[PDB]
Design an enzyme around this catalytic site. Structure first.
Site, PDB file in Angstrom:
ATOM      1  N   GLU A 239     -24.871  66.340  38.479  1.00 59.52           N
ATOM      2  CA  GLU A 239     -24.119  65.886  37.158  1.00 59.52           C
ATOM      3  C   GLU A 239     -24.666  64.403  37.003  1.00 59.52           C
ATOM      4  O   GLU A 239     -25.021  63.547  37.925  1.00 59.52           O
ATOM      5  CB  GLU A 239     -22.758  65.788  37.681  1.00 59.52           C
ATOM      6  CG  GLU A 239     -21.628  65.400  36.886  1.00 59.52           C
ATOM      7  CD  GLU A 239     -20.262  64.948  37.523  1.00 59.52           C
ATOM      8  OE1 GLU A 239     -20.231  64.591  38.590  1.00 59.52           O
ATOM      9  OE2 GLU A 239     -19.237  65.201  36.950  1.00 59.52           O
TER      10      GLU A 239
ATOM     11  N   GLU B  43     -14.426  59.281  29.653  1.00 59.98           N
ATOM     12  CA  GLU B  43     -13.588  60.013  30.752  1.00 59.98           C
ATOM     13  C   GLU B  43     -13.007  58.966  31.543  1.00 59.98           C
ATOM     14  O   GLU B  43     -13.040  57.659  31.434  1.00 59.98           O
ATOM     15  CB  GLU B  43     -14.978  60.388  31.915  1.00 59.98           C
ATOM     16  CG  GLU B  43     -14.214  60.501  33.350  1.00 59.98           C
ATOM     17  CD  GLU B  43     -15.292  61.029  34.332  1.00 59.98           C
ATOM     18  OE1 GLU B  43     -16.346  61.188  33.976  1.00 59.98           O
ATOM     19  OE2 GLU B  43     -14.667  61.548  35.350  1.00 59.98           O
TER      20      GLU B  43
END
Length: 182
Positions: free
Chosen positions: A78, A169
């Site tokens: 990620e 986020e």
């Protein structure tokens, strides 16, 4: 930008609006969130192409990021190229990989290992790669290649890409964000 993918991971935790064709999206979490969400616009398959964006980002009191975000299938990883952020720096805790200079600033680069966590395969162990901008900003171009090339010296597969998006986020606190991908 040829946007063909909408990233919505618990976008319901705040107010997520978007227009694929305009390359714009907004996200409000002014009441705060207590759980993680990642929303944004992008592509189903990532590439090393540069991404130009412009944003209104207000997340001072929030554990949040305004970042290029995506995954690599194998080795599973990620990754984030954090342009601006809130009260949390991921490289404060992670293992330092060095520095990289790109698009007008140095970025601290670090990595970390996540065990049995939410991933593009459900729950798994994967590696994270971070480039945190030293001079944070909310508008500009990210020459993704400079980051991929540096991370690749340290394990980043640099191929077999899954999705890649310009994202916002947050997993704590409250904030606001409006973003356009050119």
């Amino acid at each position: 930008a040829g946007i063909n993918y909408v990233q919505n991971y618990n976008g319901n935790l705040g107010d997520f609006t978007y227009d694929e064709s305009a390359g714009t999206f907004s996200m409000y979490w002014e009441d705060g969130v207590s759980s993680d969400f990642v929303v944004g616009l992008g592509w189903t398959t990532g590439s090393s192409n540069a991404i130009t964006y412009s944003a209104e980002y207000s997340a001072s009191g929030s554990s949040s990021y305004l970042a290029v975000y995506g995954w690599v299938n194998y080795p599973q990883a990620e990754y984030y190229i954090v342009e601006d952020y809130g009260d949390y720096n991921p490289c404060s805790s992670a293992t330092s990989l060095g520095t990289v200079y790109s698009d007008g600033s140095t970025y601290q680069v670090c990595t970390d290992t996540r065990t049995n966590e939410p991933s593009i395969t459900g729950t798994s162990t994967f590696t994270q790669y971070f480039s945190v901008r030293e001079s944070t900003r909310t508008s500009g171009t990210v020459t993704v290649a400079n980051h991929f090339n540096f991370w690749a010296q340290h394990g980043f597969g640099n191929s077999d890409f899954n999705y890649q998006v310009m994202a916002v986020e947050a997993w704590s606190g409250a904030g606001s964000a409006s973003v356009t991908i050119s």
